[PDB]
Amino acid sequence: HHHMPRSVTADASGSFLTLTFEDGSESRFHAIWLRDNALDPETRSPGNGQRLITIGDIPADTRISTALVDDGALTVTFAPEGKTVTFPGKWLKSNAYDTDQSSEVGRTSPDVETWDSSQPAPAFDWNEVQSDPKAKRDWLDAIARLGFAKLVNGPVREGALIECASMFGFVRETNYGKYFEVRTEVNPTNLQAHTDNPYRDPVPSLQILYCLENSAEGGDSIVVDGFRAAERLRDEDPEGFALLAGNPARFEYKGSDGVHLRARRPMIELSPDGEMIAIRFNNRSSAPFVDIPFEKMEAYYAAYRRLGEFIDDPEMGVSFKLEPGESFIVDNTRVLHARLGYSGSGSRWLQGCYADKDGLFSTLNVLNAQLG
Amino acid sequence: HHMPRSVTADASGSFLTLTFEDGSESRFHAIWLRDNALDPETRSPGNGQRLITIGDIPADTRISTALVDDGALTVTFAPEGKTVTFPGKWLKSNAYDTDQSSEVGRTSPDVETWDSSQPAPAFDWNEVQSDPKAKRDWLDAIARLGFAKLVNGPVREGALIECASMFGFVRETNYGKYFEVRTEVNPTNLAYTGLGLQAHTDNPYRDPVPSLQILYCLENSAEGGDSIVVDGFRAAERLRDEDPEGFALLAGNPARFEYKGSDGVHLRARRPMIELSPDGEMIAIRFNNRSSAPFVDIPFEKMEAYYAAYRRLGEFIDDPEMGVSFKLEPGESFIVDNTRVLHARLGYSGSGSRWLQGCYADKDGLFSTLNVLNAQLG
Ligand SMILES: C[N+](C)(C)CCP(=O)(O)O
Ligand SMILES: O=C(O)CCC(=O)C(=O)O
């Protein structure tokens, strides 16, 4: 009834129509938008959903000739083509644009929930996510909503992290390989939270860390929600937030290992309509900020410092241990990671790799369709 | 020019003003200079990585003294009592008090736009893999121009992967490590048909978008099947200059993209057709008629004007004077910066067969390979 069309009027111009639903709500649709979004077999390929026409193919003077609501659907005929198409009621309501578009600068998407140290680490079973699609769905949904999740009871096997990535997507291969070794000896001698690779564009969007061996005390993994840090800055200091979102920083890795990577991106990235979409924060690979005008540099640095203070706040960190066979994924466009200090001697062997979020969301979409 | 003549410090100690030998002035803040110190306690000698956090620098950091000497600036910071030296060349190269352009929709200084008046740049398969100069020049052409042909290559399946391996790494996707561009029954995508394709960037429904694409010819014996490339930055520039409001609509509102071409895949993205940096520099173009999804993020009162701007951009992209056209022969390929340069093909039919192979790679690898080659060759 929210989605059941009742009636329609076409404007005298034919430039738009106004659809009334059974609950009394109205939604206006332009002729050009309706024509471009026609769902019939000659606009959208039945076999693959690809649109068969370009914007150039649609006559510039396209108008609604006539329209009618009947049996839960809208019939519309366009001029000058003479093309008649029908739209289900549910589709029109779901794809409506005649609505109040939220414009709040720095807002998070409704699909994510921000967190601090009160958030327990989401934890899922390695075997369950492979054999139970509901478990797999919930695992990937946790990564989508919260930006991280643990996988426990996995195999103590080299390269197992690559198998984890392959459950939903594909590894971003780099000059270090499809995965890399993180070996640590801790002894008396003795042998900040960040996002990885802000000097890569596009940034690798997921990171996996997988434990094979751990005999050292302490050194718990920590995750910090970049969106929560940014939210706190926005609420306290909107001008400071605007500075970090409104000017690009520079990142560079120029090692002796034959990799020289640079990127020009802001530390807080917004969509053009103000939604917070990414965080880049890494002290080790920050490079000279050449793009910020002189008049803003002092205040930019003050805001940068303040963001760092929120990131350094121990009340923001979620900490956990990785036993052999355990791993975690972070959304590397949002959630920062680090570890706590070691409190005892021993050895550690982790493996690390990157994967991409587009594959994760596709797999999640496919699972939601299969389960719903 | 990069030789410092003299320096003054502000009363607060918050910045200094450096005057060079050509009369030019550049101001540098105390905090920015301290944060960019090049000494072994701020930057690693081994890899150049920064050894401090922003929190480690005292909040009241200020210039206690500054002097010019031997073509360099020596500065002491309070309260650390830390003295560092910056070469004049470094200060000039990394200056931010430069009156940076705020022209909305300007391109990066490192790119050069083009239309049909420039013939396609071409490089040789054997030369780029055997001569480091040729490799550098090839990769640098892709970096600057967003497009290059690689000719005289082998007529061998999977040769495009060897091409990718010359500079970087394959972005493997749902479509495969590489994909077969040929007519398929029950096609999952109109790329796999005999139909002509409007100029487009691949996978605007994928976030992150693949940043490079390789297209490699094995057979092209049918009538038609010509390749065309269009510089999306040139198209965007033309819209910017002709119609500022239209340009602003396409840069300032997200579009939607969606691919659901078979069971087992559902890719969606929410990104503008013209992506700008927050300071107005052009970053990326996303344009693909086949996978543009319903635009739900544009206010009702702006939708008609948005569509008019979209139409106009399409007219620039379809303009034959913007397209660089060629027909690939067996063993020839090209690479596009898939964030910038659009590609197209004319439909094909009749006697003959067409078989291209395609894959994605990433620019970060290309830039690293190029950067390393530039260090080694000069
Ligand atoms: C891999 N592919 C079928 C060539 C993609 C074409 P797009 O859907 O990106 O236009
Ligand atoms: O067939 C061609 O020349 C190009 C097809 C294409 O656009 C693609 O494979 O992405």
Ligand SMILES: [Fe+2]
């Ligand atoms: Fe890391």
Ligand SMILES: [Fe+2]
């Ligand atoms: Fe394509």
